[PDB]
Amino acid sequence: DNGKRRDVICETEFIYPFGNETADKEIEITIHLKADRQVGYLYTEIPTLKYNKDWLFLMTQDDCMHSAFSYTWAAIHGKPLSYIYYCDLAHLQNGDLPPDYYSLGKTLATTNGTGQEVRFSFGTTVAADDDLMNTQTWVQNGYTRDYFRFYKKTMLVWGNLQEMMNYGVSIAFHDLNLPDEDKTEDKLLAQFPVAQSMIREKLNNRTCKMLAEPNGDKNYIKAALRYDKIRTLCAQSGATKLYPFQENGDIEQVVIERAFYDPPEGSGLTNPDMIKAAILKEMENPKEERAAISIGAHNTDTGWVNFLEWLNDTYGRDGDDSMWFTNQEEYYEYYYYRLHSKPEIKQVNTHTWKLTLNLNGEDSAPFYYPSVTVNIFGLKMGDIESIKSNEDVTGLSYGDHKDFFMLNIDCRKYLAEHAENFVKRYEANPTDVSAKADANYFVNMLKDSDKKTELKKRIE
Ligand SMILES: [Co+2]
């Protein structure tokens, strides 16, 4: 019965198998050249920012907020939006939508520099040791007597966060669920693995490796530095301001500076107003001198939706495409690869070159964003007869950039199976335009293969 009230635990039908992700990748890409395009010398580098972007935007949304799903994630991913209400996953799955719902008509994204969409990425904190994540959702198609089922919840329900994981959204610790008087360094340290166990239980064995400091409470940083699963941290003070083109050291266990850009009291300005102003000032400097725009957010709203669209229209896919909009975990992993991986290219014969690179994350858990960009100097797309890759490469796109050649290499072990899960979702909901768009987006991440061809045929 469509009109009957149901109170359900939000659930998604698949989650990327984070626990199974391989920690070590061995990339081997073979480049075969056209006969009259024999080149004499090639050399390679991993660029400062993925996709050869010019500058970095980092976003972490605190307090495990309902709006991280209903506003932030929904706006990025082309989902139904509301001006005053807060959808849960089960509302979207059932088509039980609030009375003011609308859509932007597009996703919010950059390109990867080689012709594919890269949707904006961000992280949310998680209140994994808080039973309020187990709250149910009221679903009732066609019910208009009230809209209480769409009111803001105190925090995300697990199903919302589980679905966000399928789109690369990151996670971070924040407050832990202890009495205020028990928030000592030692007691917080003991509670981190308790929260971690729930994260792994619910997020298909993903391990959280980030702390967003709560409310200037340094006991959280001191405790987190003794819990070796946490590799990256952020705070407003007692941190390091990130300059992506200048930073030279290890950032293992480093507190990266992140600002909320609160507006002056009574000024009528919003946080997005303040961030926009900071971005404009920063872009006046040469890219090598720019700090990262590293931001925190609390509740997101219509103004934040419009700000995300402004970023898309100005520095993303519909603007100058200069920005890398990501979460701190993906950036941390990329910086680690740039520091420790050493791409090499060797001539195999007169017309064949072999590019090799190892991606090895830290010993605590598999890195979850095992993708890099490699530039080849001395080569152009027009020289190339064919490109082949080994099994560890699951996504591969490439093309000219400025006067050189770039490859975007994705090594997520279960990427093809993940794309097929989105295809199956579309096949089960073939009238859902957003489901078909998601299927095309994920299938387009895959390297050329029989499986990619199969999946493309299923979503024509
Ligand atoms: Co907070």
Author numbering: 40 to 499
From the paper:
Here, we present structural and functional characterization of a putative polysaccharide deacetylase from Bacteroides ovatus (BoPDA) encoded in a CPS biosynthetic locus. Structural analysis of BoPDA revealed an atypical domain architecture that is unique to this enzyme, with a carbohydrate esterase 4 (CE4) superfamily catalytic domain inserted into a carbohydrate binding module (CBM). Additionally, BoPDA lacks the canonical CE4 His-His-Asp metal binding motif and our structures show it utilizes a noncanonical His-Asp dyad to bind metal ions. BoPDA is a lipoprotein unique to Bacteroides and likely has a role in the biosynthesis of capsular polysaccharides.
Four crystal structures of BoPDA bound to divalent cations were solved: to Co2+, Ni2+, Zn2+, and Cu2+ at 1.42 Å, 1.48 Å, 1.36 Å and 1.56 Å respectively. Co2+, Ni2+ and Zn2+ are the most common cations used by CE4 enzymes for catalysis. Our four metal-bound BoPDA crystal structures allowed us to investigate the metal-binding strategy of BoPDA given it lacks the canonical His-His-Asp triad. In the Co2+ bound BoPDA structure the divalent cation is coordinated with a His213-Asp102 dyad and four water molecules. The Co2+ ion is coordinated through typical octahedral geometry when validated using the CheckMyMetal (CMM) server, with acceptable values for all the CMM parameters. A composite omit map was generated for the BoPDA-Co2+ structure and it shows clear, defined density for the Co2+ cation and each water molecule modeled. Additionally, instead of four water molecules completing the metal binding site as in the BoPDA-Co2+ structure, there is a glycerol molecule (green, sticks) and 1 to 2 waters interacting with the Ni2+, Zn2+ or Cu2+ ion. Taken together, this suggests that the preferred metal for BoPDA is likely Co2+, and it may have reduced or no activity with Ni2+, Zn2+, or Cu2+. Through analysis of our structures, we hypothesize that Co2+ might be the catalytically relevant divalent ion for BoPDA enzymatic activity.
